[PDB]
Design a protein around this ligand. Structure first.
Ligand SMILES: Nc1ncnc2c1ncn2[C@@H]1O[C@H](COP(=O)(O)OP(=O)(O)OP(=O)(O)O)[C@@H](O)[C@H]1O
Ligand SMILES: Nc1ncnc2c1ncn2[C@@H]1O[C@H](COP(=O)(O)OP(=O)(O)OP(=O)(O)O)[C@@H](O)[C@H]1O
Ligand SMILES: Nc1ncnc2c1ncn2[C@@H]1O[C@H](COP(=O)(O)OP(=O)(O)O)[C@@H](O)[C@H]1O
Ligand SMILES: [Mg+2]
Ligand SMILES: [Mg+2]
Ligand SMILES: [Mg+2]
Lengths: 152, 365, 46, 166, 487, 523
């Protein structure tokens, strides 16, 4: 629904900004605010775009406001596909994200191998995984390369 | 080392009976982890939870070892950094413990050297023993038709008021007192008075020398205890026996009464966990729960554990899934019949339905 | 005949029960797997 | 020459010459069975000639395998092979097959099995090679004189309470 | 949305053998066949049959092969109609599966026409009254529960009582000389049994590969998934219907076992969102079986003589499946395990069997009267057996013992060695004519053979064989007496 | 040049031995009934099997190993292939899991293959000797046959199958490896100790060289218990498709169904009878249909199945028990009452049957079995309703059916023939076993110097194959066979039975009692 509404106007970054504001606001809301939620009353959501606020009220009616962090993921995937962007997830140890030079090289090599993503633009997104103490892993369009080690 | 999830903070999200859901912002800890409720809640005793399932990456379902009275949503919970551990070593000898390993005898601190988790993996194939010998109990029917095997597994299947407990006491008097090794009495869903009577009897026989060295440990989670405790006391008592068997290479006796209540307790929680129930109403994981527990009760190359387990047959229906599944996990089976007792015959053993594994000329004369 | 007529009745009474916990266990598992969905109602109009 | 057909009417390969050559190039007679296995898998059922070659390999082979196998017996293997051929394949053993068996009995010194095979050839076939009959009798004479005609423990006098029932 | 041929859909759910398919242009009609074209790395093609419509676009279906290696969003293409099977004389001597594909490895089959497996049953006006006795060469069946040409026959039995053996004997006795054609449908039975049947038929020249065959085989067995076992019966029945209508021939239809058709549908019923009925069968048990059974009938165009084997689970004839099939038959043969344990084969319980043509108008008066007298005597004998156990044989009156002695001979005289069970019995089988059976029993009832030894009636054919066995028994007894005399 | 796996999603929920997966948006997806690897660590993975594919995209997973290491949020990789396990002669003598991992002791085959086609089979005509006189005579078993072993707890269900495996050791050593019988013993839900005892027992008799064990102990998750029969038969299909014969034992299918029920209920599959899933029959049906006797065109190999099933209070009306009985080609029913009555093995001949029939018996055994069957049938009826020949020999046949270890074919067939032709009429029933022991392990004629036979002696073990070829009732062997029996009977009666009947001393009486009981457990 949020993709279809945004497609008519042609702007998709507005929704992404709205999710960013929602995530920032939720960090200050009390625990289990989804279950005590009246989005209309919350002032943080008053600055959101009409499609996003409409969706939030749609969820609050059905009591599914806990899916905010997952609907955003789907929307980003739709936007990236529409904009022809391929995101490579770089899983690194907590605090080990400083060096990603090898990760970028691996991501580019995977991008070259994939024929479908020939026209897509490469993007890198860092993720922190506590399961790995050393090294890194790269995931792109399902292709996962592991160059990491954990506790012995 | 130190667990990476110790001190993790969560909030209570749902409460139903003894089953509690906890939401952790940073991620649910590993299964079997122990959690402590920090909020006072006006309770008279602390509240501890054990994780059994993961509903999602952040939510985890747990069973409470104590009553969940005066428990509200959003209550704060803290991970302990590991599973439920209990004391081990000679310091536990002559002492009474509960599911959590806390001494209930009102006596001095245990001062154990270390603690070990209740949940552990069973011995593997290469660590199995091959020793068969006869344990003489002094009872005619057992020593003749279904002789018991040293270091083996023995079961006493019986109804209500048939003689299961009496036979255990007779075995304890005739074996445990004159036993070189150690002994562990695991009370599970049985009368509290019986534990008290046993404790007095063990003190009078000086198996428990309050001022000297003792040879017996008592672990008791009784009927009054909630289902969560009755489903884990057996693990804790068994863990102590494992330590004596392996860390010391010492022969151990393990008197469990009653094992049926263990399966019954898991049934009660499973209904609350939202699992479709199997035949009769038992949990679908009835066989797996027994298998994990019983396989730990075995004699390895390091030591020997002779286990005697009382089994309760509900409504005198021996085809009930609980006792029926237990037959395959026992070397010796002793079936008691109500009709035989009503004829004045004690013990009420039904020899035709009894069996033993050492009934082999290659072992006995 | 009064010991095989008290076990022809204790066994007819456990069939009517055990066979109804078996229909009503399937019904309860064919109901929870029928998931509730998003309602396309007028939440604004209320 | 004439196409053979299997139980269900499908044709079976009849050119079993190459397999016989493979059989005649084996060192241990257990390897011969592998060739028969391959023949069956390739839908090339063995003929009378193939079985005779297998018997020849058994007689001429040193042992069943490179490493010794406990309780191995050439006679037992050949008799079982004949049983398969006559019963599960419907082929009548010829004189050549029985002669190989008789040679093995003579070579192995089993003079009692030779007597039974001697009658078999005298019953199904036309007599026995007189060379082997005399040799078998000669084997008997040797242990007839050596005090080894019957294992001694069998001949020990026993009694009702003098027998050890293991 | 009239012609849905080539319509495309996508797989939406996969749970066991049940698959949900989504069509953007509208789900095709129920019972439609779909192929999963998208190459998923499978060794066998995957076909589905629509059974339900969840909405205007989604449809639930049952697969005919294993659903292994099946992914979501895979591409489905409709076949434009229901599952079709070849028909005609070109199928004779051949083996088929539920999908109508030959599995005999005997080359392509020349098919001039194909027919859907799902068809509407004949109406009331299309019913033909054919009351003619069928001679199976078996004493028990021909006497107590005679079979009718163009009718329906059931062989109800447990496991190991002889249902399959009787079918083999019937084929050997009725199919070899049958003027028309035959169709055998294996449904959820052992695969080796079908193989033995195929070999036997080839030996008996029913299936002449070089010449002209006169039988068809359709096999969906235990190994096959429930989807195949729920439709194989329809496929074979479709072939018989074509021979009945188009060819206007009198056809035989053997089915073993029809219960598996009910069992397979029960297995999938749970996954279709249907609450189980009593015992645990599907709620649609009676309706689904009725539609199939009504198709198995003789119409004004042709005749179908149907023999169906019914499995009574755990020897419980009160079970819904066996009971529901009793009303769809013209002749029921109920087998009892106790009879077999006594060495009596076939292990038929005459007191429980029934036949529609057991009326004087249809069969000869002597046949009707003899059968009833036999049944009455057997009923009375069972009543006496209760007395004989409490009092003992001595207490019985003169009349009662005569009934006992005669009845015991009847019980043993009903036994008969079949030509197909020679390995089991070790003796040659017998084919007893209808007239011989009636005369033999008639004389026995009135005491014409009271002096014959009881065992002379055990595992024999007609009366002539009884006399020969009695003579042999006398000779051996004399030899034993002579041996004793010398001692 | 990277070892790129196929990530398909994350782990959402865990309930004991099963789990659920949520797919990451825009990913290839996973296929049904395929294997997946849950990354419990950057270098360690846990095996899972796909079981459900829901509309929501969630995936049901049956865990197989390293369950304790699985946590919510972990990554999942899809191999995209079905389950394949090692198969070959290099696995014999080893203990393995359903996944093929070897268990320390103190070619890839697919697990989801289809059964042979109708035209790919052949009639059963090759016997598989269990070593027990009762079974081999009244309940023939042929290679490529499924013979259920149904009984109550503690009745010999396991012992008989193990003895059957052991009885092939002596045969396999003599005959060519072509006709050797390999063994696949599958333990399901059993105690780990019992597997070890079985392993030692097989090792003592040297059966490991021709046998392999596949163990899924009780402590192991239900998934392994559910796949053990399929993995076990898969190892046995390697030999079947290569012109060799195999014997697969399942101990036991009753505990497999429990595991399948546990998995189905946890993964929200609607329940059925006794809470079992609707498709529980199809589980065993496709397992036992894979055991067949391939046609000459495909090699002639076979797989023989001996599934084991447990009942309650001799109730064969249960659900799974009935389903298995309707599938197998025969059943051996072990009765509790007979077992406690001293009859061991406690085979109930009346309730036992083999649908293959005499076709699975050797030509030598056919004649003995056919005549023996008639005598017993009469013997059952005579006593149920007076010393006549059928009643005299029937009791002795029953006494001969008591055994503790498998018997060599030559010894068993000879003893049955003797009792058949009245040679034991003068021998008391109590002394039959003692008579048999002397016949097999002794030779009275040689002891008393009255043996005139040329070749036919019980110590010549090589005569077994001659007997199996020509039959006992043939001119070659019949003449000497009768002479030996006649001498053995006369010597036995004169020198042994006379003294035995003259014993009155308590010491002598007790000594005789021990001897006869020992003879039961010796021959
Ligand atoms: N060996 C015995 N001799 C005499 N009486 C006995 C014997 N065993 C049991 N009883 C009688 O049976 C009663 C119940 O015995 P017991 O306490 O062993 O029951 P139980 O099997 O433990 O049953 P539950 O614990 O469920 O009550 C005793 O109080 C006594 O009256
Ligand atoms: N033929 C036999 N003669 C004497 N004893 C036997 C014989 N077969 C088995 N036994 C003994 O009977 C007991 C039970 O045998 P077994 O282990 O085969 O039982 P089972 O059918 O596997 O039962 P369960 O597995 O449920 O314990 C054992 O003590 C075994 O040694
Ligand atoms: N006419 C018969 N004579 C002897 N035994 C028979 C006969 N018919 C059946 N049997 C017995 O039944 C077995 C075959 O059973 P079967 O016909 O397959 O029954 P079902 O299919 O109902 O289980 C035979 O092996 C034999 O033991
Ligand atoms: Mg008690
Ligand atoms: Mg049948
Ligand atoms: Mg067993």
């Amino acid at each position: 629904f949020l993709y279809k509404a945004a497609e008519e106007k042609g702007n998709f970054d507005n929704i992404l900004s709205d999710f960013q504001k929602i995530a920032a606001a939720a960090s200050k809301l009390p625990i289990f605010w989804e279950r005590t939620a009246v989005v209309e009353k919350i002032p943080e959501f008053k600055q959101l775009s009409e499609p996003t606020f409409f969706t939030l009220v749609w969820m609050q009616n059905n009591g599914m406001l806990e899916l905010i962090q997952e609907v955003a993921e789907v929307y980003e995937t739709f936007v990236n596909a529409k904009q022809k962007k391929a995101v490579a997830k770089i899983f690194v140890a907590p605090g080990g994200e400083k060096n990603v030079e090898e990760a970028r090289r691996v991501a580019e090599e995977l991008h070259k191998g994939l024929k479908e993503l020939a026209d897509y633009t490469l993007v890198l997104k860092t993720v922190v995984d506590r399961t790995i103490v050393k090294g890194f892993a790269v995931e792109l369009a399902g292709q996962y390369v592991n160059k990491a080690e954990g506790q012995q | 080392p130190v667990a990476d999830h110790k001190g993790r903070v969560g909030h209570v999200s749902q409460v139903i009976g003894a089953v509690v859901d906890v939401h952790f912002a940073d991620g649910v800890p590993p299964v079997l982890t122990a959690l402590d409720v920090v909020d006072k809640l006006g309770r008279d005793e602390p509240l501890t939870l054990e994780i059994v399932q993961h509903l999602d990456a952040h939510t985890g379902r747990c069973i409470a070892m104590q009553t969940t009275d005066l428990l509200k949503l959003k209550a704060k919970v803290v991970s302990t950094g590991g599973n439920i551990s209990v004391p081990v070593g000679r310091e536990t000898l002559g002492r009474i413990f509960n599911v959590l390993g806390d001494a209930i005898d009102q006596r001095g601190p245990v001062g154990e050297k270390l603690r070990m988790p209740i949940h552990a993996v069973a011995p593997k194939l290469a660590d199995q023993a091959a020793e068969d010998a006869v344990l003489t109990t002094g009872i005619k029917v057992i020593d003749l038709i279904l002789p018991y095997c040293k270091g083996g597994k023995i079961g006493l299947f019986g109804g209500a008021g048939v003689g299961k407990t009496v036979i255990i006491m007779e075995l304890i008097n005739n074996v445990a007192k004159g036993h070189g090794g150690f002994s562990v009495f695991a009370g599970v869903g049985e009368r509290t008075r019986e534990g008290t009577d046993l404790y007095l009897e063990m003190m009078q026989s000086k198996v428990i020398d309050l001022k000297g060295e003792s040879k017996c440990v008592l672990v008791y989670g009784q009927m009054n205890e909630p289902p969560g405790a009755r489903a884990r006391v057996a693990q804790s008592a068994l863990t102590m026996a494992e330590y004596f068997r392996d860390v010391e290479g010492q022969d151990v006796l393990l008197f469990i009464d009653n094992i049926f209540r263990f399966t019954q307790a898991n049934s009660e929680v499973s209904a609350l966990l939202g699992r479709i129930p199997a035949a009769v109403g038992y949990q679908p994981t009835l066989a797996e729960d027994l298998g994990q527990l019983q396989e730990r009760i075995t004699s390895t190359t390091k030591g020997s554990i002779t286990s005697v387990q009382a089994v309760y047959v509900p409504a005198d229906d021996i085809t009930d899934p609980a006792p029926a599944t237990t037959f395959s996990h026992l070397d010796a089976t002793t079936v008691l019949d109500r009709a035989v007792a009503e004829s004045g015959i004690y013990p009420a053993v039904n020899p035709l339905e009894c069996a033993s594994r050492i009934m082999d000329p290659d072992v006995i004369s | 005949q009064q010991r095989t007529s008290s076990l022809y009745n204790k066994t007819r009474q456990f069939g009517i029960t055990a066979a109804l916990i078996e229909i009503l266990s399937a019904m309860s598992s064919l109901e929870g797997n029928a998931m509730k969905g998003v309602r396309r109602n007028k939440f604004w109009e209320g | 020459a004439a196409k053979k057909y299997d139980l269900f009417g499908y044709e079976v390969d009849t050119n079993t010459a190459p397999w016989i050559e493979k059989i005649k190039k084996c060192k241990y007679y257990d390897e011969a069975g592998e060739v028969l296995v391959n023949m069956n898998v390739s839908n090339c059922p063995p003929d009378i000639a193939t079985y005779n070659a297998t018997l020849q390999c058994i007689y001429q082979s040193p042992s069943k395998q490179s490493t010794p196998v406990d309780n191995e017996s050439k006679f037992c293997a050949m008799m079982d092979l004949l049983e398969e051929m006559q019963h599960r394949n419907r082929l009548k053993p010829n004189e050549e097959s029985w002669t190989w068996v008789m040679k093995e009995c003579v070579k192995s010194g089993q003079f009692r099995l030779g007597y039974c095979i001697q009658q078999v050839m005298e019953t199904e076939c036309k007599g026995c090679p007189a060379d082997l009959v005399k040799a078998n009798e000669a084997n008997a004479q040797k242990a007839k004189t050596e005090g080894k005609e019957h294992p001694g423990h069998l001949s020990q006098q026993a009694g009702l309470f003098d027998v050890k029932v293991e | 949305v009239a012609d849905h041929k080539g319509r495309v859909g996508h797989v939406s759910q996969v749970i066991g053998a049940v698959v949900d398919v989504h069509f953007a242009d509208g789900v095709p009609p129920v019972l439609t066949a779909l192929d999963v074209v998208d190459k998923l790395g499978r060794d066998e093609p995957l076909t589905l049959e629509i059974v339900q419509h969840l909405d205007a676009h989604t449809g639930r279906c049952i697969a005919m092969q294993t659903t292994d290696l099946l992914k979501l969003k895979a591409k489905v293409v409709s076949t434009g109609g229901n599952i079709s099977v070849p028909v005609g004389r070109e199928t004779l001597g051949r083996i088929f599966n539920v999908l109508g594909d030959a599995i005999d490895q005997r080359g392509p089959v020349g098919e001039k026409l194909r027919m859907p497996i799902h068809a509407v049953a004949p109406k009331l006006a299309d019913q033909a009254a054919e009351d003619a006795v069928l001679t199976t060469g078996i004493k028990v069946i021909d006497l107590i529960l005679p079979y009718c040409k163009g009718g329906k026959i059931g062989l109800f039995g447990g496991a190991g009582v002889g249902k399959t053996v009787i079918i083999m004997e019937l084929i050997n006795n009725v199919a070899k000389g049958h003027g028309g054609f035959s169709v055998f449908a294996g449904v959820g039975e052992r695969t080796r049994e079908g193989t033995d049947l195929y070999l036997e038929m080839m030996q008996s020249k029913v299936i002449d590969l070089k010449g002209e065959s006169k039988c068809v085989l359709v096999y969906g067995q235990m190994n096959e998934p429930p989807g195949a076992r729920a439709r194989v019966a329809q496929s074979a029945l479709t072939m018989a219907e074509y021979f009945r209508d188009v060819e206007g021939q009198d056809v035989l239809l053997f089915i073993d076992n029809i219960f598996r058709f009910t069992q397979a549908n029960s297995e999938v019923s749970a996954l279709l969102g249907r609450i189980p009925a009593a015992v645990g069968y599907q709620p649609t048990l009676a309706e689904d079986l009725g539609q199939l059974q009504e198709r198995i009938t003789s119409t004004t165009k042709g005749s179908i003589t149907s023999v169906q084997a019914v499995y009574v689970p755990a020897d419980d004839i009160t079970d819904p499946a066996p009971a529901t099939t009793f009303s769809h038959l013209d002749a029921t043969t109920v087998l009892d395990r106790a009879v077999a344990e006594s060495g009596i084969y076939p292990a038929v319980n005459p007191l429980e069997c029934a036949s529609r043509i057991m009326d004087p108008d249809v069969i000869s008066v002597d046949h009707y009267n003899v059968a009833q007298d036999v049944v009455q005597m057997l009923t009375k004998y069972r009543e006496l057996q209760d007395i004989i156990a409490v009092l003992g044989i001595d207490e019985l009156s003169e009349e009662d013992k005569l009934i006992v002695d005669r009845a015991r001979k009847l019980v043993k005289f009903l036994s008969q060695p079949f030509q197909v069970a020679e390995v089991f019995t070790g003796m040659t089988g017998h084919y007893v004519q209808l007239d011989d059976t009636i005369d033999s029993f008639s004389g026995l009832l009135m005491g014409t053979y009271d002096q014959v030894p009881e065992m002379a009636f055990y595992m024999v054919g007609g009366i002539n064989s009884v006399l020969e066995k009695a003579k042999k028994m006398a000779e051996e007894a004399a030899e034993l007496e002579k041996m004793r005399r010398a001692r | 040049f990277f070892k790129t796996t196929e990530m398909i999603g994350y782990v959402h929920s865990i309930d004991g031995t099963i789990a659920t997966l949520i797919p990451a948006p825009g990913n290839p997806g996973v296929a049904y009934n395929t294997i997946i690897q849950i990354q419990v660590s950057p270098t360690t993975f846990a095996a899972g099997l796909v079981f459900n594919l829901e509309k929501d995209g969630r995936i049901g997973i049956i865990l197989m190993d390293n369950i304790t290491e699985v946590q919510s949020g972990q990554k999942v990789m899809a191999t995209g292939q079905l389950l394949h396990i090692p198969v070959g002669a290099g696995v014999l003598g080893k203990v393995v899991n359903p996944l093929g991992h070897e268990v320390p002791v103190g070619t890839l085959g697919k697990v989801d293959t289809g059964a042979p086609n109708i035209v790919s089979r052949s009639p059963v005509n090759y016997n598989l000797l269990t070593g027990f006189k009762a079974v081999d005579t009244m309940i023939p078993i042929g290679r490529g046959q499924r013979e259920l072993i149904v009984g109550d707890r503690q009745t010999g269900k396991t012992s008989i199958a193990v003895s059957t495996i052991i009885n092939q050791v002596r045969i396999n050593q003599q005959i060519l490896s072509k006709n050797a019988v390999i063994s696949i013993y599958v333990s399901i839900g059993q105690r780990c100790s019992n597997v070890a005892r079985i392993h030692r027992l097989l090792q003592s008799y040297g059966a490991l060289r021709y046998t392999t064990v596949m163990a899924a102990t009780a402590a192991e998750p239900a998934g392994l218990q559910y796949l053990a029969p399929y993995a076990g038969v898969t190892m046995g299909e390697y030999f079947m498709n290569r012109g060799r014969h195999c014997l697969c034992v399942y101990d036991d299918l009753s505990k497999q169904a429990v595991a399948y029920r546990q998995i189905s209920l946890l993964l929200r599959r609607p329940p059925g009878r006794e809470a079992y899933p609707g498709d529980v029959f199809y589980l065993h049906s496709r397992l036992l249909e894979r055991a067949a006797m391939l046609s000459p065109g495909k090699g002639g190999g076979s797989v023989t199945a001996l599934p084991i099933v447990e009942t309650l209070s001799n109730d064969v009306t249960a659900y799974i028990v009935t389903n298995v009985i309707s599938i197998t080609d025969g059943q051996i029913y072990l009765d509790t009452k007979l077992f406690t009555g001293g009859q061991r093995p406690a085979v109930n001949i009346g309730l036992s049957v083999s649908r293959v029939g005499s076709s699975a018996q050797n030509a030598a055994m056919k004649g003995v079995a056919g005549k023996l069957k008639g005598i017993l049938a009469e013997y059952r009826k005579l006593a149920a309703d007076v010393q006549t020949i059928p009643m005299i020999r029937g009791a002795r046949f029953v006494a001969l059916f008591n055994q503790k270890q498998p018997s060599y074919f030559m010894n068993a067939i000879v003893s049955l023939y003797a009792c058949l032709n009245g040679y034991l009429d003068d021998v008391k029933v109590q002394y039959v076993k003692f008579y048999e022991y002397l016949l097999v392990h002794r030779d009275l004629g040689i002891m008393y110097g009255t043996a005139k036979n040329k070749f036919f002696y019980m110590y010549v073990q090589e005569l077994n194959y001659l007997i199996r070829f020509f039959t006992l009732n043939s001119p070659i062997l019949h003449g000497e066979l009768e002479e030996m029996l006649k001498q053995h009977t006369h010597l036995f009666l004169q020198h042994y039975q006379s003294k035995m009947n003259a014993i009155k001393s308590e010491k002598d009486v007790k000594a005789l009692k021990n001897l006869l009981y020992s003879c039961k457990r010796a021959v």
